[PDB]
Amino acid sequence: SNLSELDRLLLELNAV
Amino acid sequence: SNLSELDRLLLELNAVQ
Amino acid sequence: EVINQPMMMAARQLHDEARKWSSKGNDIIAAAKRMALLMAEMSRLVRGGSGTKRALIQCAKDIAKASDEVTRLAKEVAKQCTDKRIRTNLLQVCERIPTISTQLKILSTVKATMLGRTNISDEESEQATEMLVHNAQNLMQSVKETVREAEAASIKIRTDAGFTLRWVRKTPWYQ
Amino acid sequence: LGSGEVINQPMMMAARQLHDEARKWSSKGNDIIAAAKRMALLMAEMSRLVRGGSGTKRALIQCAKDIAKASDEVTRLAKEVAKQCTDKRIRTNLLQVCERIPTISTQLKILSTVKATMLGRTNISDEESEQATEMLVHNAQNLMQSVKETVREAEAASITLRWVR
Amino acid sequence: EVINQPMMMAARQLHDEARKWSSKGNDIIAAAKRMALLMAEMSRLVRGGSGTKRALIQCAKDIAKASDEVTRLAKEVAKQCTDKRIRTNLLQVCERIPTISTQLKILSTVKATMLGRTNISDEESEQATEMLVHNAQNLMQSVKETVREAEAASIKIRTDAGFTLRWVRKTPWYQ
Amino acid sequence: GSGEVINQPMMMAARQLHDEARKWSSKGNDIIAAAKRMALLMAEMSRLVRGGSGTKRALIQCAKDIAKASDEVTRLAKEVAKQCTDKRIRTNLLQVCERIPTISTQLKILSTVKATMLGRTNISDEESEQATEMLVHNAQNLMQSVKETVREAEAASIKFTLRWVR
Amino acid sequence: MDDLDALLADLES
Amino acid sequence: MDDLDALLADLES
Numbered sequence A: 001s002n003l004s005e006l007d008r009l010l011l012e013l014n015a016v
Numbered sequence B: 001s002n003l004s005e006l007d008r009l010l011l012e013l014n015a016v017q
Numbered sequence C, E: 001e002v003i004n005q006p007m008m009m010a011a012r013q014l015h016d017e018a019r020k021w022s023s024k025g026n027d028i029i030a031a032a033k034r035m036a037l038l039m040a041e042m043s044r045l046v047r048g049g050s051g052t053k054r055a056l057i058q059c060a061k062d063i064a065k066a067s068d069e070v071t072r073l074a075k076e077v078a079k080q081c082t083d084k085r086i087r088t089n090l091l092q093v094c095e096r097i098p099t100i101s102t103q104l105k106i107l108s109t110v111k112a113t114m115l116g117r118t119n120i121s122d123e124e125s126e127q128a129t130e131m132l133v134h135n136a137q138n139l140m141q142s143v144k145e146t147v148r149e150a151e152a153a154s155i156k157i158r159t160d161a162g163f164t165l166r167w168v169r170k171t172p173w174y175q
Numbered sequence D: 001l002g003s004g005e006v007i008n009q010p011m012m013m014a015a016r017q018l019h020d021e022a023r024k025w026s027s028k029g030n031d032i033i034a035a036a037k038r039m040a041l042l043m044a045e046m047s048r049l050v051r052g053g054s055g056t057k058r059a060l061i062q063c064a065k066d067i068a069k070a071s072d073e074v075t076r077l078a079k080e081v082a083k084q085c086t087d088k089r090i091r092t093n094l095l096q097v098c099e100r101i102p103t104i105s106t107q108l109k110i111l112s113t114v115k116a117t118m119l120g121r122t123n124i125s126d127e128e129s130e131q132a133t134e135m136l137v138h139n140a141q142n143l144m145q146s147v148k149e150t151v152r153e154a155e156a157a158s159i160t161l162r163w164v165r
Numbered sequence F: 001g002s003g004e005v006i007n008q009p010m011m012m013a014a015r016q017l018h019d020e021a022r023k024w025s026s027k028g029n030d031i032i033a034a035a036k037r038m039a040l041l042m043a044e045m046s047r048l049v050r051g052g053s054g055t056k057r058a059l060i061q062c063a064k065d066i067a068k069a070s071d072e073v074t075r076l077a078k079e080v081a082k083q084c085t086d087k088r089i090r091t092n093l094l095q096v097c098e099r100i101p102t103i104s105t106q107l108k109i110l111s112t113v114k115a116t117m118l119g120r121t122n123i124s125d126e127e128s129e130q131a132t133e134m135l136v137h138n139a140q141n142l143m144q145s146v147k148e149t150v151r152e153a154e155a156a157s158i159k160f161t162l163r164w165v166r
Numbered sequence G, H: 001m002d003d004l005d006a007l008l009a010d011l012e013s
Helices: A005-014 B005-014 C005-019 C027-045 C052-080 C084-094 C097-114 C122-155 D009-023 D031-049 D056-084 D088-098 D101-118 D126-157 E005-018 E027-045 E052-080 E084-094 E097-114 E122-153 F008-022 F030-048 F055-083 F087-097 F100-116 F125-156 G003-011 H002-010
Strands: none
Touching: A005 C122, A005 F030, A005 F055, A005 H002, B005 D031, B005 D056, B005 G003, C005 C027, C005 C122, C027 C052, C027 C122, C027 D009, C052 C084, C052 C097, C052 C122, C052 D009, C084 C122, C084 H002, C097 C122, C122 H002, D009 D031, D009 D126, D031 D056, D031 D126, D056 D088, D056 D101, D056 D126, D088 D126, D101 D126, E005 E027, E005 E122, E027 E052, E027 E122, E027 F008, E052 E084, E052 E097, E052 E122, E052 F008, E084 E122, E084 G003, E097 E122, E122 G003, F008 F030, F008 F125, F030 F055, F030 F125, F055 F087, F055 F100, F055 F125, F087 F125, F100 F125
């Protein structure tokens, strides 16, 4: 579904 | 007062640069 | 001002997916923002008006140039992904895009020539719109999922990465 | 679900088309790029102004005049570039594009006046209004394309100017 | 979360007066937006917390840096302004800013040191907070009016101009 | 209202470092690269220390990342000090950058603590607050120690070389 | 009713 | 949803 602030931060943290 | 779009345009336009 | 609602709605849904991310070091997001804007523009152009014919053709062209951008980039990220499921699903979604935008241009030139003309009937005119909106929706939706998959793809990269996009949230004004 | 702005879209698109082309290059030592950017913005304004409002009639006139001044600059500069070029094709194609600009610019102004006159005016027919916008948009688009292609032809002639990203 | 409302409202007001303008070729607008962001932070720091003493002081210093910037840039544009009234009203409002930010730093160092201590009374704690808000509201109001007067002074610049800011609106996503 | 549920002081510290490194180009400058990654990592920390689904484990990760990046900054700053021929500058550089490994190691340790007691009932407010306090303090000392290493690096990069183009 | 307001009113009347 | 959600769920459970 649509991403939340946390969802995006984790992505951001996990994306190389 | 606070500016509208048309306000800010006339400012932009007239603003010497 | 009257605009085509579905096209604007679809334009907004792509934008929402892209707007929270930075365009720096990410041409997929950069192009995903360009395409949202272009779709919003097209939502106004389909309503007829002065200078519409030309602008609606040149718009679809600009949506095609942006489509190719997205597609090519999404293949390079897919190339670098170590997860096969993510790699397959990304390719499946993005490889449909070129076809869709090619159809979008064809139907745009159709609708462009129909504007102004009287001999064109209502049904013919209305149907030409509904074909254009259908494809537009499919383009935006395809591009939308292609971004999502590309985000997923960017997690499961090989450490010997040839190509890579930058995934960083934009800073709020009140941060 | 909202339009967002009250603008003529074709005219805005033309503005952005030229902006996209001009944006690439630096202006530090390239007045055609600087002039192009100015005209791009000027055009972006026109697209709002032609829809009317308090102060638009006059600003549509002033906006047009500015566009025509920048038109002169582009033309004058383009000609100087054509002089140095030592290619039969590129030099010829440049002059074919950049010489059209003075004409288009003058017609723009003329039609810019016509529209400015008939904004907020009841004694003007729908027909006459529509056609006046139509003529105006057609020259607006032509101008942006002419200038855009004049920018491109200059760098193709560039062997002076600065063409750095 | 429970922040200080008056300071967030000030931060938010100043942000509205700058946000629609571009920061490219306009260090006044950039300074404004930076200051608005900093007051947003201060609004959260004042209620106290882990690392707030140090953060609050540093925050105050930062606002004082951006202040001296808006001041000096305002004195330049005023130097080129041919209209004396506008040149007078901008000089008045802008030359006020250095004194306020200095008092802000003082009061912020005060509040910072009160945060954590038990030897402070509620009267003295609340009053120190009120003082800080008072100076904050004024600073943000001053800068806000310094911005507008710069926009007014930009119209009345001498043709043989030494210094000139850029005033261009920000393009929205749907343009 | 608030805008973000974060620890504002740690966001500040992050932004302070980001303002320093943003001035310079990373291209020929791994210090700057590391620094920019550290600011972003420390910014993400300022959200993770609040908590929510997935945070405990991300806070461990994020801390490890900060430690990795910290070591890079230290190693690079040492090489710069070797080349420098000015007594004061080469000393003052070494008096800053050699703190970073320590401050980092403490940051990991405290991050693990605060990660363990997120979403957990058997933890006092005093203990919870004091954990957050030691964390923020180390996190602020890290950003400051790095920020001054970046500054001392260039002041020493009068001339391994680095690139300091704006 | 500041200098900016005054100048905008002049440009719109 | 698709693969992006599946990865976010993984990281939050």
